[PDB]
């Protein structure tokens, strides 16, 4: 249990990148989508204005 | 487990980029769509109060 132990924490960190990749990633996507979205919307808000 | 994590990180990459462009590439298109509407009705608008 002691050799499993000291090859599972190289596995946990591994685990932990690959969560930090996923969960940055989505957080990501969405919010410059939402970013993108809202500046079309406050360019043609110009241009209705206008 | 080991081996597999290290192929999985970059699995992970990967659809996050996927995911940022089907994301983007949805709201912009929403969003431009609107803004054309938007534009011709605007000029329509012109054209009926002269």
Not at 9 to 17: D, G, H
Not at 23 to 48: D, H, P, W
């Amino acid at each position: 249990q002691s050799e499993a132990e000291k090859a599972r924490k190289e596995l946990l960190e591994l685990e932990a990148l690959s969560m930090a990749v996923e969960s940055t990633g989505t957080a990501k996507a969405e919010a410059e989508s939402r970013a993108e979205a809202a500046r079309i919307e406050g360019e043609g808000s110009v241009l209705q204005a206008k």
